[PDB]
Design a protein around this ligand. Sequence first.
Ligand SMILES: O=c1ccn([C@@H]2O[C@H](COP(=O)(O)OP(=O)(O)O)[C@@H](O)[C@H]2O)c(=O)[nH]1
Ligand SMILES: O=c1ccn([C@@H]2O[C@H](COP(=O)(O)OP(=O)(O)O)[C@@H](O)[C@H]2O)c(=O)[nH]1
Ligand SMILES: [Ca+2]
Ligand SMILES: [Mn+2]
Lengths: 123, 272
Amino acid sequence: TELTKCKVSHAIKDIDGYQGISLLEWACVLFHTSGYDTQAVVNDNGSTEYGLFQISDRFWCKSSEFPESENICGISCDKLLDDELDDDIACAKKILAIKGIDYWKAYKPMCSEKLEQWRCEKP
Amino acid sequence: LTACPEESPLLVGPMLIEFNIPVDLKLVEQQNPKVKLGGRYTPMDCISPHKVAIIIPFRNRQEHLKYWLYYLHPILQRQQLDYGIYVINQAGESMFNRAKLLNVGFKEALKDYDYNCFVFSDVDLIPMNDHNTYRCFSQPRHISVAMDKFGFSLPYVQYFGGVSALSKQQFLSINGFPNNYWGWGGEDDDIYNRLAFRGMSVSRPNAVIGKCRMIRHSRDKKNEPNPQRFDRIAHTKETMLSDGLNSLTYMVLEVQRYPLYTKITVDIGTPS
Ligand SMILES: O=c1ccn([C@@H]2O[C@H](COP(=O)(O)OP(=O)(O)O)[C@@H](O)[C@H]2O)c(=O)[nH]1
Ligand SMILES: O=c1ccn([C@@H]2O[C@H](COP(=O)(O)OP(=O)(O)O)[C@@H](O)[C@H]2O)c(=O)[nH]1
Ligand SMILES: [Ca+2]
Ligand SMILES: [Mn+2]
């Protein structure tokens, strides 16, 4: 489900400020990360990243592919391919607390400036 | 003998762009008799100062190309451009390399005519207003500004993907485009960075005259997101001296001249 800047901004509300990242930076990161597609599935050197946040099955979620994963978020990777973002967000929160914002590689190069444009301009 | 006017009197403004009625290139050829073998058109009424080579990155996108040809040949003519159409076809079945095919387009078009302007256009983007001229400006030109795909909005101010235009000198100044971006994403942000590191900024038509349509499609097999794009994008400043025009290598497998375009199949190697 291809969402939009604003839907995303509205859905993502509860992650705001956590670990110091604003909704502006998140909209920016998610656009470059998943194109705002909740069903985004991208391969990366033998592992797979899921949904809006592109959470990897290598350490964060359990996938039928490789069950040995530490499944840190304690969720099935498939649950990050639906339109309920609460668990995606909950897991993103763990990543932030453990590894930090740099898990999202789009952050530093694409979201270190010109953040104003990322605000949802609709109530 | 008379220089064409800074603005064309043939322009029509906004146009209707739909992708249902199947096109017939033969029918398209008929509607465009001034277009010569190889996809070359030059104004007879006046002398245009815009010698433009339109470069299309390509592989298995023939349906898109028919639509592209059907809408753009009439537009580019109205824009009184002295243009040539080049479809750079990637031979083989390994990872797609958009930017690298564009560099090839640049060197190969130069063999035909002394073009002074280069328009790099994706095969599936059609402008919705002929006021969006396909030519070069005082600064590099980003042309596909307000795509329906993005709500007729620019996804992000640093975006240089889709349809861009650089003069020969502007292109030469950044050592062309990178050859090391395989798979989808980041090659355009890298190009964007290249412009900044050379003191150039981006010029754009406004969001109204810049409306464009992209034929809807899924990501092509062999052009999956490039996992390294984000890290490559951060070293543009240094890698642009070693990766680009000066390091381009490819082999021409075949040159095809059709009435509506020139298509060049090349072998650009593999991700290494
Ligand atoms: O298998 C492929 C992949 C890409 N392209 C060309 O590369 C451009 C950009 O790729 P894509 O359409 O995926 O770009 P995006 O839609 O994501 O801007 C296309 O428009 C085509 O001109 C192609 O010809 N064959
Ligand atoms: O200006 C043109 C270009 C192409 N064609 C037709 O479009 C087809 C395109 O075939 P394709 O590119 O798939 O063949 P390839 O070039 O790869 O042999 C040709 O065979 C022609 O019948 C045409 O009628 N006018
Ligand atoms: Ca979910
Ligand atoms: Mn496309």
